[model samples]
Target: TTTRTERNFAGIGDVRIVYDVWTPDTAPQAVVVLAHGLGEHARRYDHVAQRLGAAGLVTYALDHRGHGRSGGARVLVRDISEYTADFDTLVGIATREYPGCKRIVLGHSMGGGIVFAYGVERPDNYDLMVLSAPAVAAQDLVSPVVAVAAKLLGVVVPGLPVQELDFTAISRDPEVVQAYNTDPLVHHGRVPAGIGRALLQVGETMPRRAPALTAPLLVLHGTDDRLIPIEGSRRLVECVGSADVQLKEYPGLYHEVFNEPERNQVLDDVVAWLTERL
Candidate 1:
């Protein structure tokens, strides 16, 4: 049997972050901290937590500020650094809650970008890192006019909502799409101009700082991802300083590789990799 627990913790500034933890009845072999993608909440990873828990790995997933139960201005942030800071708080909580366990950080899409940026900011924090379809180069997906508007408004009215993402590009699974479409906790608002600008800036900066990341890394992406390009994952693999980095590309998968029809394969691969490391 596994135990699932939810709690709230103080995050960067006044934000009260919500997180869920899944633990096996037996002692855990490792601790995996999951950072979900944009517009999604931590509970969406219930399947992932169950699988990891069955494999004797504890999983902790937190809702980013402005999303889910976390307290903050909805879908708005001043800088990308704020995301990294919140993740750092989660890391501290994980360290205290599961002492002596090997720590692994996993991030998806926007969260992938956050994790990558966090790696650059704190090089020696985690034992391993996993990036799933990181948004390292999403400039190509944004319209030129919207991109310029985001830059202008970011400086003028940072809080103005300016960008809206297509959730259909998230997965090929109809059920996944339907669930996401109706989930009340999931955010579907336009991105704040400042937040949009910060994401772009972070996406541009991560590659240059890739060489600074020292932990063992694994990057996974769907070859057909429409939201964030898979090319960025390849670039990250090519530029990261870690000699132990690996990349896995799924030919027909979409942006949300873990929620795709072949998600079990993705989960199995993750567990296999973590098992080897453990």
Candidate 2:
């Protein structure tokens, strides 16, 4: 059995960051902090959290700044570091609330890049990192011309909306796609110019930083993903300093593996990995 609770924390500059926790009936052996992808909210991961909780691990998921219930300009930030800072704050809250539990961090898409960036800068923060189709090398997703324009606007018009992602590319499951399109809390807006520039910078630099990631890492990607390439996950495995890095590629799936038709299988694989480590 599991219980879910919604909460909020003070993020950078004391902004409210909405978050949720799923706890098992028994004492948890570990804590898993989840960072959701851009334009999505924490609640979208309830199924993942529930599964983790049922496996005796407490799960915490947060809505990043400018997304979901969090306070900020919609889908906008000054730098990618802001997202990492928000993750740090969430970790603090998780540790304080569940002392002495092994900490594992998971991120998806844009959030994956944020976690990867954070892991490089602070390698010892978590016992393991799970990246689901990280946006480490998103050249295929963004055009060079748009990238240049975003950089320019980042300085002159940081708040300007810049179209980036296509929602249809997120998943192959029609129901999931429909739900995403209809989700009131989900933002279908364009990325801000400054945020877009920051994401481009992250894509360019994350692979280099991979060599500094010391935590055990599990990289998951879909070979058929149209949004982000599995090649990035392979590159991460190749460069990460951790000797325990593993890459799991799912054939014929889309970007959101956890929301794919085989989501249960994906969740099971995730649980198995965490269980082995915990």
Candidate 3:
């Protein structure tokens, strides 16, 4: 059985963020920090963390502020900077507590984008970063007029959640869709106006930050993803400052590649990447 440890760590504004740690019985060769995507809590990564732990790498996953068991306004972050700051606190705690282990970070979807920005901003923090179907762009593919309107109204009604936005097209998987719509732990709907604005700001700034990233990176994306465009991954590869990068494209997979039917293979690939770095 995989060894597991759970804890509540203090995050930004003294909010307590819950996290789970999984490690093999023996000393770990490496330590990985896993961050979940938008609206999802860290528990969703339990299976993946267990797999990594079984492979001799310790895995740590933390609930983002305002989500899961963390204390904050539900489904809210003051800005993208706050998200990065929260991640910094988590990493600082792990690195201090587990010295000598090679540190790696893996983020999915929105968390993917956050990880990229974090790695670029603090290049010496981690040995590697993995971005899985990161949400660098919104799914709607909207127009200039709509964009201008959003920006205008966003400043005034930043607390108002946009309800007109349709979520039915989030994914093709029935189980994924149902879980998203029904999960009480999930953020339940569109992000708050201010959070949405922050996302847009990050989406615009992330590509620019890419050129400054120096850590080794592995970017994986589903070719037919309906949520985040595969082009975002390609663009990231082209823009990142690092030449030591690997890109993987799964032809028929969905947005959450690790949760798909072929996840075993995906898990193998992840372990292989970590092993190679080790």
Candidate 4:
């Protein structure tokens, strides 16, 4: 029920990012662009893409610049805004190739963080946005003063990697943690200076700009998420300017809700939410 294809996208400098396109062949009514999080590639969303394709939506996912098969200086970014530019390229292509279809975005973790920044800046590109367990802020367990310290360092030395967390912080499932640790595509360690800085900017600026966002949004986070606290998502919902926003939190779910044991239920909720809005 799915037709898989590939496309090459040009990124910063001369890097070419590779992307996967999943279509149902029967003309797409709408398109969902899946933005994978930091340290991971598009193929990780294969299951989500297939499911979306089966629902009559063409799903496109791209390996971000420097990740997976994509070409770049391997996580080299002079400006964090380059991620938005790269996304702009992909979205432009999708709109051109699939005319007359609703364009929506599904962003995960770091992707979600990037999407929030993009939406806040562009504000009119995508019809809707889905942010899944987005990493918008550091946990409260860390002192507020320390968080500020990190942000200061991020602005000054954006290229330096600050903190490192065990991949197990994402989930309680031993197998999932093991796979994440072992997965060739999964990024499991320190972040580069530019990306680290970008995260800091995103964490600070996004909350401030939430009220300016006009696009309908769905923010999904897990109550038990340890990586990025669920408070970020909650604060986002309260602050964002979008009047049409739905915030849902899974009771015991961890960071990667889609990869959780109750993933089917999570996917069902996502599809239903998208369907309602679309």
Candidate 5:
């Protein structure tokens, strides 16, 4: 069994990033630092961490600021830079705790953009990068009004809560949907207008910055995903300068591929990819 350990480290200014580390059965050869999607906490990835641990890869998942147990206004992001900065802080914690281990950063949804930005900004820190249904491209879920409102109203009242994701769109598995629906740590309320704009801003700009990330990259997206369009992943891969990138498309999965019924099998591919790089 993999042991789950929690830690809270200092982030930008007074923020403290609360994160969980899943220890492997023995010494780990590589470390997987996971960045969670919007509205979810680090704990939601327990199963994933366990799967990686069984493969002898230590996994560290963090709750982003303004979400989960971390310090900040609820679902509020002042600037996209802050989100990436928080990711760097979590990476530092994982690095200090696991010296000399090969490093990999993985993210889902909005986190997909955050981790990607992290790799682009600090290229030498991580050896591999993985993105799941990244928010690098704005999908139909976000209204144009919300995007425009964010740039305008978001400037004066960045904390004005206005939008949220459709929880049912997250998974096709009934049990997984229920679990997310009942998770209190997962932000259920509408997102702040400021962060709404921040999310859109990154979506438009992250892919353009993709060429700066030259590491081996693995991007996973479900073909049937409704919440985030598969085009986002396609566009990301198209923009990358790396020749080693692979965009794995799961034919019949939803937004949360890791929580799907075939999660073990899905993760099997993930572990295999990591093993090859290690």
Candidate 6:
């Protein structure tokens, strides 16, 4: 039988952070700590972790602060470091729980920014990292004025909802859209000013800090993504000088490549990449 455990523990500043661990029936070959995207909880990656588990990997996904069941104002991002720090904590937890195994960090969209920032800050932390549509470059969805106003209001009203996401643009599959739209844990509200400011700042600086990441990198993106376009992934692969870096583009896919109609194939590609490295 498969094993999946969901629980909460005190995170940075004693904030309750909820996370889930999916384990295969046998011993795991590695440990993967996942970081979820903006306005969504870690459980949204249930299918992802399950797939990883089936592949002999133990996966742990945490609900970053201000999102999901984690403590903090909804969708509030005080700073990119706060998010990275929390993920780093989860990484350490996963490391201790599954000692001697290789460590891999993965993130999606906003979480991808957090993951990249974490690797930048701690170059020697993880052995590998995978970013799905990472927000590493300036997004076309956001304008210059919005970025500036976000920084200004981030300090004054960090929790003020600034922009909302278009769920329909996430994927071509209506079920994926409906599931995300109706998920109670998923915050469909406007992103807070602080979150916007924090993410934008990371996107601005991560490219420059790309060299700090010593781990092998894999960047995946959907070409037709209207949210955080594939350009970010293209730019990141170009910036990182890692000898094992790669960028895989899924043509005609939306932002959520793994949730698209070709999800199985997309996931197979991920497994293939991991297998090659393993």
- lDDT of all the models against the reference? 0.86, 0.86, 0.77, 0.79, 0.85, 0.84
After superposition on all CA atoms, what RMSD does each candidate show versus the true structure?
1.5, 1.4, 2.3, 2.3, 1.5, 1.3
Worst 10 residues of 5 by lDDT: 137-146
What TM-score, computed on C-alpha atoms, does each candidate reach?
A: 0.95, 0.96, 0.91, 0.91, 0.95, 0.96
Pairing residues by index, what is the TM-score of model 5? 0.95
Candidate 1 similarity to native, TM-score = 0.95
lDDT of 2 by residue, 1-278 (tens): 88889899888878889898899998789999999988899888988888888889998899998889999877777777888999998888898988899899999999898888888887887888998998887555677877887888876787787775678989999899999999988987777787777777788887677889887899889999888888878887898899888999999999999999998999899989888877
How do these models rank on lDDT, best leading? 2, 1, 5, 6, 4, 3
Residue 200 lDDT, candidate 6, scale 0-100: 78
List residue ranges in candidate 1 displaced over 4 A: none
Q: How many backbone clashes does candidate 2 have?
A: 0
Model 2 scores a TM of 0.96
Q: How would you encode candidate 1's per-residue C-alpha lDDT over 87-169 as one tens digit per residue?
A: 99888889998889989999998898888888888887789999899877756668888778777787567678777777888
By summed lDDT, which 10 consecutive residues of candidate 1 come out lowest? Answer: 198-207
- Cα lDDT tens digits for candidate 4, 1-278: 88889889777676898988899957677898878887878877778887788678898888888787898756655455888788878888888988799989888998897788888887888899999987666434345654555556655665566566667767767787787788876666676655666676777676678777888899888899888888889988988888899888999988888778887788888888888888
Candidate 6, which segments miss by more than 4 Å at Cα? 139-141
Clashing pairs in 5: none
Off by over 4 Å in 5: 139-141
